[PDB]
């Protein structure tokens, strides 16, 4: 699921699944 | 940023993990 165009909720979902208990930062303006 | 690398273009696991804490 990671190797495609990922926008919005799709991108946030991928970060969530990939990063697991680490969590992540989602910075669309940076 | 992430939008340019994963939304406007195809994402990769390598790049996604750069955003994990």
Swiss-Prot record, chain A:
Changing residue 10 to D: In HPRI; Providence. This is Insulin B chain. The chain holds residues 25 to 54 of 110 of the full protein.
């Amino acid at each position: 699921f990671v190797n495609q165009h990922l926008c919005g909720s799709h991108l946030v979902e991928a970060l969530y699944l990939v990063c697991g208990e680490r969590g992540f930062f989602y910075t669309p303006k940076a | 940023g992430i939008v340019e690398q994963c939304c406007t273009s195809i994402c990769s696991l390598y790049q996604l993990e750069n955003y994990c804490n």
